[PDB]
C-alpha cells in the first residue's frame, strides 16, 4: 500500500508538494511515476524519478514542463511531486504508481478559500419501506468537493450507507450531496437518534443527529 | 505514442465474454518475446488497479477470466465472463518510451435486467430553513438503466432550474445505481409554494413515480 498526501486548495500561482510514502516496501529500488486524471476524464501521465542506480534520473511531461519537480527521500521512504506556478488546468486526481498505485490526492487551484459542509438531519415525508426505515443528510455548500467521507453510527447486516458524488451548485464554487442510512426499523426505534459522521477536507469533522421515524 | 482503444463504452450482459482492442503508433514488442504494454481497470472513485503486465502476464490476485494477447501495435484484452465486480474503465497502457501513454479508456458496463427505482422525498429540514434556504431531496434506489429522468415540481410548475444531482458508480454485486436530485430554493420562495413533488421516468416504471408533500403537513 502506497500512502499519499500533500494534496488539496492551493492558490494559482502558489504550490504544493504532494508525498507518496511506501509501507512495507522500500521507495530506493523502485521507479516512481506520477500520473493525474482531472474530473471524469483519463489518465495523463506526468513524470518519473528513476531508481537510484540510474543516478535519480527524472524524464518529464511538455504539458506542465518547468514547473514540475519529482524528488526522492529514501530516508523517508517517500517520494514527491513539487508543483509550482499552479494554473486552474492543473486542478485533477493526482496518483503516484511504482508494482502498486497510491489512493490519490485532489489538486484545487482556486483563489477560493475552503467551505465546510452545511449537515443537515432529513426525515422521509414520503412512504417507509417495508421493515426499514430510511433517514438521510443533506452535505450542502462545500469546497473543495473532495475529500468528503460520510459515515454513520449504525452498520451491520441489512444496513445500507448510500453516498452520492458531489456535485456542483447552480452558481458559485460550492457542491452538494447527500448521504443515506437505510436500515431495519428494529435497528432505529421511536425516541432513538442516529449520527452520519461528515469528514471534509482538512476541517473538523461533523456529527450531525438524525432521530429515528 | 498515442494509444487508441477500442469500443470506448460497452455494456455486457452478466456472464458473457466481452473483449477490448488497444493499438500503439509504435512496436511496444522487446528482445524478451514479450511487450512493453499494461492493461488496468478504474472504478470510480477508486485508483487504478493492474490486470495485465508484459502484455499478456496476469498481475496479483487478478481471477483467470482476464486474458491479455497481441503483439508490437494490435493488443486485446479478454474477459471470460463478466461478473457484476467487473464494471469500470479498462486503460491500456505503454511503458516503452516517455511520455508513458494511456488508451482513452473504455467504460464496461454490467447490462443486468431492468429494474426500476424506489423513491424518497425528503421535505427542508427546520435547521437549514433557519439558514434562509431550502433544500428538498429525491433519492432512488438501485434502478438499472442508469438513465432515469427526475422532474421537480412546486405547484404543479415543473422546474427548469435549482436542481443538481449525481448518480453513484454501477454497483459492484447487484449491478444497480442510486440517484440524489436536490431541489434548492430560498427560503422565501419555499414559503411561498405549497406542493413539492419529483417525478421520475425510467425504464423500469410503466407509469412516472411521483413522491410529493404540501409544506408545513408533514
Known amino acids: 500500500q502506497l500512502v499519499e498526501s500533500g494534496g488539496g486548495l492551493v492558490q494559482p500561482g502558489g504550490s504544493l508538494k504532494l508525498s507518496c510514502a511506501a509501507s512495507?516496501?522500500?521507495?530506493?529500488?523502485?521507479?516512481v511515476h506520477w500520473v493525474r486524471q482531472a474530473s471524469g476524464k483519463g489518465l495523463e501521465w506526468v513524470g518519473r524519478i528513476k531508481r537510484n542506480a540510474e543516478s535519480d534520473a527524472t524524464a518529464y511531461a511538455a504539458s506542465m514542463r518547468g514547473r514540475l519537480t519529482i524528488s526522492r527521500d529514501d530516508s523517508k521512504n517517500t517520494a514527491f511531486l513539487q508543483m509550482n506556478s499552479l494554473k486552474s488546468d492543473d486542478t485533477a486526481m493526482y496518483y503516484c504508481?511504482?508494482?502498486?498505485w497510491g489512493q490519490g490526492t485532489l489538486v484545487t487551484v482556486s483563489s477560493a478559500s475552503p467551505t465546510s459542509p452545511k449537515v443537515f438531519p432529513l426525515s422521509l415525508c414520503s412512504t417507509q419501506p417495508d421493515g426499514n426505515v430510511v433517514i438521510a443528510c443533506l452535505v450542502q455548500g462545500f469546497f473543495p468537493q473532495e475529500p468528503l467521507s460520510v459515515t454513520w453510527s449504525e452498520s451491520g447486516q441489512g444496513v445500507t450507507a448510500r453516498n452520492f458524488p458531489p456535485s456542483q451548485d447552480a452558481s458559485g464554487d460550492l457542491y452538494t450531496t447527500s448521504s443515506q442510512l437505510t436500515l431495519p426499523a428494529t435497528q432505529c426505534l421511536a425516541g432513538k437518534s442516529v449520527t452520519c459522521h461528515v469528514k471534509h477536507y482538512t476541517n473538523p469533522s461533523q456529527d450531525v443527529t438524525v432521530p429515528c421515524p | 505514442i498515442v494509444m487508441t482503444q477500442s469500443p470506448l463504452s460497452l455494456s455486457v450482459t452478466p456472464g458473457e465474454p466481452a473483449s477490448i482492442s488497444c493499438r500503439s503508433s509504435?512496436?511496444?514488442?522487446?528482445?524478451?518475446?514479450?511487450?512493453?504494454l499494461e492493461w488496468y481497470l478504474q472504478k470510480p472513485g477508486q485508483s487504478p488497479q493492474p490486470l495485465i503486465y508484459?502484455?499478456?502476464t496476469r498481475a496479483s490476485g487478478v481471477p483467470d477470466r482476464f486474458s491479455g494477447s497481441g503483439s508490437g501495435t494490435d493488443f486485446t484484452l479478454k474477459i471470460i465472463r463478466v461478473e457484476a465486480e467487473d464494471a469500470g474503465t479498462y486503460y491500456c497502457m505503454q511503458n516503452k518510451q516517455t511520455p508513458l501513454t494511456f488508451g482513452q479508456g473504455t467504460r464496461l458496463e454490467i447490462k443486468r435486467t431492468v429494474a426500476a427505482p424506489s423513491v424518497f422525498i425528503f421535505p427542508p429540514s427546520d435547521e437549514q430553513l433557519k439558514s434562509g434556504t431550502a433544500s428538498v431531496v429525491c433519492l432512488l434506489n438501485n434502478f438499472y438503466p442508469r438513465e432515469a429522468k427526475v422532474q421537480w415540481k412546486v405547484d404543479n410548475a415543473l422546474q427548469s432550474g435549482n436542481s443538481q444531482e449525481s448518480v453513484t458508480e454501477q454497483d459492484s454485486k447487484d449491478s444497480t445505481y442510486s440517484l440524489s436530485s436536490t431541489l434548492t430554493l430560498s427560503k422565501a420562495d419555499y414559503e411561498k409554494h405549497k406542493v413539492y413533488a419529483c417525478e421520475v421516468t425510467h425504464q423500469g416504471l410503466s407509469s412516472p413515480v411521483t413522491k410529493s408533500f404540501n409544506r408545513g403537513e408533514c
Open positions: 504508481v511504482i508494482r502498486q
Open positions: 509504435q512496436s511496444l514488442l522487446r528482445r524478451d518475446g514479450h511487450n512493453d
Open positions: 512495507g516496501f522500500t521507495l530506493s529500488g523502485s521507479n
Open positions: 508484459l502484455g499478456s
